[PDB]
Amino acid sequence: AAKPKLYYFNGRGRMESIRWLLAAAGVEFEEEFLETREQYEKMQKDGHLLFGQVPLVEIDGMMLTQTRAILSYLAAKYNLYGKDLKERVRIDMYADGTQDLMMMIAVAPFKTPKEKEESYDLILSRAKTRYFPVFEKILKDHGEAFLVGNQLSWADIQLLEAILMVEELSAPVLSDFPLLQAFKTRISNIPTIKKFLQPGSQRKPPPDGPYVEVVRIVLKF
Amino acid sequence: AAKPKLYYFNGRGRMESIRWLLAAAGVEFEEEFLETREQYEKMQKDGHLLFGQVPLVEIDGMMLTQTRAILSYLAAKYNLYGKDLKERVRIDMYADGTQDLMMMIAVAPFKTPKEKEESYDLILSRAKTRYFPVFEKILKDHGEAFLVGNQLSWADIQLLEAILMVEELSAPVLSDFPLLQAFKTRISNIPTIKKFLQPGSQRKPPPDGPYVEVVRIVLKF
Numbered sequence: 001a002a003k004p005k006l007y008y009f010n011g012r013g014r015m016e017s018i019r020w021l022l023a024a025a026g027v028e029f030e031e032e033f034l035e036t037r038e039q040y041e042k043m044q045k046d047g048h049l050l051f052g053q054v055p056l057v058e059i060d061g062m063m064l065t066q067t068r069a070i071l072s073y074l075a076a077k078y079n080l081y082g083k084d085l086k087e088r089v090r091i092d093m094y095a096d097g098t099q100d101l102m103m104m105i106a107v108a109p110f111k112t113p114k115e116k117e118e119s120y121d122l123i124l125s126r127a128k129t130r131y132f133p134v135f136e137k138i139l140k141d142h143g144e145a146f147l148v149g150n151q152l153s154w155a156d157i158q159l160l161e162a163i164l165m166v167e168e169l170s171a172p173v174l175s176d177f178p179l180l181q182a183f184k185t186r187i188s189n190i191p192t193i194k195k196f197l198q199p200g201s202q203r204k205p206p207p208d209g210p211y212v213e214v215v216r217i218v219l220k221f
Numbered sequence: 222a223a224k225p226k227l228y229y230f231n232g233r234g235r236m237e238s239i240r241w242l243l244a245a246a247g248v249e250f251e252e253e254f255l256e257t258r259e260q261y262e263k264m265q266k267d268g269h270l271l272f273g274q275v276p277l278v279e280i281d282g283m284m285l286t287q288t289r290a291i292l293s294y295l296a297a298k299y300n301l302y303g304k305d306l307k308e309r310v311r312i313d314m315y316a317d318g319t320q321d322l323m324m325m326i327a328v329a330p331f332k333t334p335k336e337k338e339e340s341y342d343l344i345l346s347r348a349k350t351r352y353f354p355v356f357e358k359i360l361k362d363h364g365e366a367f368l369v370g371n372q373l374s375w376a377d378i379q380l381l382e383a384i385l386m387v388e389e390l391s392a393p394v395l396s397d398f399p400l401l402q403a404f405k406t407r408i409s410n411i412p413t414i415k416k417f418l419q420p421g422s423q424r425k426p427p428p429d430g431p432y433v434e435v436v437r438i439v440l441k442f
């Protein structure tokens with residue numbers, strides 16, 4: 001058997017969504033870490049990071065190096081990638097949207113004070129007036145627990161995380177999205193999802209000052 | 222019948238990779254263009270666009286809207302995604318770097334002449350060391366026709382488009398790379414590819430003056 005080890009910084013980043021999916025997959029995973037600019041260089045020159053970039057996930061003997069390349073491998077392996085091509089596309093179409101949303105968030109910290117300020121306000125508007133109303137309707141129109149084949153999917157997860165991450169900025173955000181709140185609590189109380197959500201987990205906190213710089217040092221921003 | 226009427230701009234942009242995919246596949250297609258913002262608004266008003274963002278590509282009675290997804294769907298349909306999920310992912314990683322490379326290029330015209338030089342130099346220096354040496358090494362190792370396990374795959378098509386995408390800046394670049402020049406030829410020599418590379422094909426021209434100014438209008442950038 002394999003013991004899923006994942007290298008990346010100590011924070012959200014492109015490794016977060018990977019953690020979630022694994023947790024929900026009901027899988028225990030250990031993990032290394034990245035702190036020094038030289039640490040990068042070692043494993044770099046070690047010959048692992050195909051295009052010389054992380055995240056990286058030692059699993060099945062393979063060394064995955066590209067984000068979405070990784071997620072897709074995972075989700076499919078652990079049957080959360082729909083069944084037929086018709087549905088798998090709905091997942092992806094969804095995942096790309098949330099991803100875009102979460103992405104705007106993970107990046108704003110590096111921006112200048114005026115920059116990150118203006119981008120945050122915007123994140124709310126793009127979530128409230130573009131990404132949330134759409135998901136609310138998907139739920140209302142088909143009235144169901146899940147999002148696609150009436151079964152747990154990586155789109156379900158991806159959405160939850162996205163909702164959580166958005167409330168961390170504005171808590172009363174879901175104020176106008178009923179079907180979602182239900183979705184949130186419904187999914188939150190899922191066994192594997194709850195465990196990962198309890199104070200004891202591998203889950204990481206939001207982007208903090210110390211983390212920003214510890215990043216700009218390992219990669220030389 | 223099969224009428225992939227994919228809506229987008231008169232330029233390369235995000236669709237360009239999609240076009241290449243349909244091309245090699247051996248699938249003809251139409252493509253209504255994006256001229257006035259009144260189109261964008263009125264179309265987005267009909268709920269053709271999920272999160273309100275093109276590429277838009279109606280196919281199989283459906284109406285897809287998220288790039289990475291669209292490629293993933295097509296590639297899978299037209300049997301160009303490995304033999305199992307391991308090949309699928311391997312391909313996915315490759316397709317990611319190529320898409321990364323093609324991305325700073327595709328956005329370049331938007332910046333400013335000053336940035337352009339640096340960025341373009343960066344692209345070259347990145348492509349020459351970052352990606353090409355990697356691909357070359359691979360082709361040598363498993364020494365065979367295609368990058369994957371002997372069969373046209375999304376990767377190959379992604380690489381070729383990438384190669385030529387850069388040669389339109391540094392014609393002599395592929396010189397230091399033997400296996401890449403060889404791969405380049407045989408792949409251009411694909412029946413369906415050669416026909417897509419013909420002077421009469423739907424293949425779009427690299428970005429330009431009016432193309433850089435249209436988006437800033439239609440999409441009010």
Ligand SMILES: CCCCC[C@H]1O[C@@H](O)C[C@@H]1SC[C@H](NC(=O)CC[C@H](N)C(=O)O)C(=O)NCC(=O)O
Pocket residue numbers: 096233234235273274275276286287288289327328436440
């Ligand atoms: C001109 C083409 C390539 C470079 C610039 C474009 O690429 C995008 O990164 C930004 C721009 S314009 C194209 C832009 N697409 C996106 O921003 C979403 C990308 C997503 N992967 C998708 O499948 O649609 C748009 O459709 N409108 C933006 C807006 O209001 O949401």
Ligand SMILES: N[C@@H](CCC(=O)N[C@@H](CS)C(=O)NCC(=O)O)C(=O)O
Pocket residue numbers: 014051052053054055065066067068219317
């Ligand atoms: N988008 C690529 C990674 C791109 C990227 O910015 N990754 C950063 C983490 S923020 C990295 O790995 N460092 C850049 C480097 O290799 O110097 C992927 O999906 O694997």
